Amino acid sequence: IVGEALEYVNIGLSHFLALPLAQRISLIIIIPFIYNIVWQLLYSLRKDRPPLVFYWIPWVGSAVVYGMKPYEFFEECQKKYGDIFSFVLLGRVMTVYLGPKGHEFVFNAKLADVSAEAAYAHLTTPVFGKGVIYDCPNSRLMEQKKFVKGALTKEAFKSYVPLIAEEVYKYFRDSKNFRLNERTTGTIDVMVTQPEMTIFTASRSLLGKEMRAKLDTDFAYLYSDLDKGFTPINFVFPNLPLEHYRKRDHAQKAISGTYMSLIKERRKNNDIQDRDLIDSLMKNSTYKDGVKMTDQEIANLLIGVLMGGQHTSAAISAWILLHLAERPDVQQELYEEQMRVLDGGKKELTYDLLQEMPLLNQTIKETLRMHHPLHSLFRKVMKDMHVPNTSYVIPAGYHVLVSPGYTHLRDEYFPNAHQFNIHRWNNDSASSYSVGEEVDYGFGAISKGVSSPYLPFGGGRHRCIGEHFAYCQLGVLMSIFIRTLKWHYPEGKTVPPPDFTSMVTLPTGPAKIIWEKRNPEQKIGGRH
Numbered sequence: 001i002v003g004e005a006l007e008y009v010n011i012g013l014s015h016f017l018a019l020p021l022a023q024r025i026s027l028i029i030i031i032p033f034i035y036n037i038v039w040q041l042l043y044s045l046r047k048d049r050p051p052l053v054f055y056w057i058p059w060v061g062s063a064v065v066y067g068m069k070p071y072e073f074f075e076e077c078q079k080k081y082g083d084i085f086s087f088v089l090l091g092r093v094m095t096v097y098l099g100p101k102g103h104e105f106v107f108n109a110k111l112a113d114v115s116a117e118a119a120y121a122h123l124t125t126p127v128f129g130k131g132v133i134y135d136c137p138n139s140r141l142m143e144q145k146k147f148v149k150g151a152l153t154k155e156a157f158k159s160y161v162p163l164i165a166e167e168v169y170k171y172f173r174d175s176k177n178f179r180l181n182e183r184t185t186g187t188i189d190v191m192v193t194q195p196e197m198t199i200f201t202a203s204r205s206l207l208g209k210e211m212r213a214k215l216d217t218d219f220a221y222l223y224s225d226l227d228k229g230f231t232p233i234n235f236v237f238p239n240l241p242l243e244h245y246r247k248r249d250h251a252q253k254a255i256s257g258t259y260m261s262l263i264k265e266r267r268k269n270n271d272i273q274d275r276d277l278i279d280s281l282m283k284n285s286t287y288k289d290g291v292k293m294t295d296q297e298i299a300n301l302l303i304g305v306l307m308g309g310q311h312t313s314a315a316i317s318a319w320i321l322l323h324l325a326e327r328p329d330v331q332q333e334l335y336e337e338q339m340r341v342l343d344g345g346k347k348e349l350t351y352d353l354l355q356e357m358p359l360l361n362q363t364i365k366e367t368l369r370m371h372h373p374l375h376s377l378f379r380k381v382m383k384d385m386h387v388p389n390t391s392y393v394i395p396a397g398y399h400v401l402v403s404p405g406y407t408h409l410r411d412e413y414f415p416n417a418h419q420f421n422i423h424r425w426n427n428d429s430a431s432s433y434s435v436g437e438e439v440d441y442g443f444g445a446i447s448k449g450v451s452s453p454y455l456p457f458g459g460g461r462h463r464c465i466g467e468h469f470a471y472c473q474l475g476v477l478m479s480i481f482i483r484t485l486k487w488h489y490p491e492g493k494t495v496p497p498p499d500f501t502s503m504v505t506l507p508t509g510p511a512k513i514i515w516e517k518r519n520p521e522q523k524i525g526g527r528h
């Protein structure tokens with residue numbers, strides 16, 4: 001008789017359902033908890049899986065320690081498990097592959113194996129709009145990047161430089177944070193000034209004068225509203241009926257409506273030049289199967305592009321100011337380079353002269369090493385992946401995480417990695433360089449290997465295309481800061497630690513510096 005056991009199964013299930021409610025809820029908690037611990041122990045027996053970081057709370061996983069201190073998390077995990085390990089994160093299993101072989105595994109993964117859009121779309125599509133970036137197939141994305149790269153040529157940068165410079169000078173002249181014609185010293189929060197300087201400079205050069213003019217009005221607040229939908233909370237809860245979710249949606253419609261108004265206006269008057277990225281996309285937005293981008297998709301793409309440059313660049317110029325505030329030796333060395341390359345300030349800044357300022361560009365390069373703004377990049381695994389030279393298979397449904405910014409801070413590859421030293425890039429001041437062979441995924445030839453330990457712009461098919469614009473924007477900005485101001489910390493303040501909980505690895509605020517005019521009597525012209 002084992003039927004008698006089957007009877008007591010049914011009886012036991014019957015008594016379960018009749019349990020007092022305090023015992024039921026108590027069982028609703030402890031049973032997943034116990035089963036979770038039981039499941040991790042069994043999982044650790046598989047030799048075709050990377051080790052899984054142990055965790056107590058089901059579903060939540062290591063979310064708290066990963067979210068607050070991801071590089072300390074990766075360091076402890078690397079010590080216990082080596083370079084490949086998994087961890088549970090708010091319902092998803094993330095497989096991390098640290099170091100240059102990790103860069104190869106994730107950035108050069110076959111298009112069939114992994115998907116960036118399946119990882120990112122739920123966050124970006126409500127902010128940018130439909131049909132662009134991650135709300136479309138990869139081949140569309142490749143061509144959208146090709147279209148945008150067409151306003152990111154050397155000739156475009158040659159004309160952007162005086163525009164960016166003018167925006168910087170107007171901001172020194174007009175912003176409450178400076179007012180250089182009335183004040184010779186002052187205190188600023190770089191997390192206030194740098195997001196504003198970034199949007200002004202990128203709008204004026206990428207979007208044009210009209211969109212720049214609209215930033216002088218209350219329209220400028222729509223970018224802040226749009227910004228607030230770009231939070232890690234939208235990573236797990238992409239649609240909650242709360243108020244900031246609808247200010248995001250409203251801002252996306254109002255901003256893209258403004259871009260579309262300008263677009264349809266320029267087509268109506270045949271006023272399509274080579275001024276800005278709007279002109280460029282109006283003349284160059286037809287895919288290779290004949291389909292043209294709609295005016296809505298062009299506007300959504302312009303949002304994406306500005307947004308992709310907004311927080312990365314603002315973060316980096318904040319960190320450059322913060323590192324230089326305790327390094328008056330570096331400020332003095334950069335000042336001397338400015339005086340030699342620009343003939344005591346007599347020469348006007350041009351894109352070509354920016355290329356003759358190695359120490360300035362090394363400063364950007366070194367800030368991008370220490371403060372990579374995206375600590376983790378993600379893909380969702382679409383087919384089972386064997387990791388080379390191991391027995392591991394990463395099953396479809398997992399995510400892979402790569403973190404070049406973690407490698408940037410490893411002493412093995414950058415001696416004394418937590419020291420800020422622009423001279424470690426002596427003789428190698430280029431934003432990056434294909435160290436050999438190349439490959440074209442649709443938006444131009446880029447490095448084929450991605451094993452460099454230094455990868456601030458990623459690699460492979462999802463590689464950044466804003467790198468030269470970022471260097472051009474940061475280079476003009478810092479050139480002018482250095483020629484105009486010295487700055488330092490208030491007594492007892494130093495370089496703040498990064499805040500890893502936001503989209504980018506921002507300084508913990510308020511990160512304040514004190515500035516003073518190098519030439520207290522110098523006046524910025526124009527009208528205000």
Ligand code: HEM
Pocket residue numbers: 116141145305306308309310312313316368372373374377378456457458459461462463464465466467469470
């Ligand atoms: C300091 C400045 C910047 C840094 C450090 C940076 C970093 C990155 C990284 C690491 C990626 C790859 C993401 C991944 O592989 O998952 C990326 C992609 C991208 N970024 Fe940048 N970026 C910067 C500035 C910009 C600017 C100024 C723009 C636009 C003008 C831009 C637009 C893009 C675009 C279009 C992509 C392609 C995304 C894809 O193909 O999936 N970025 N960026």
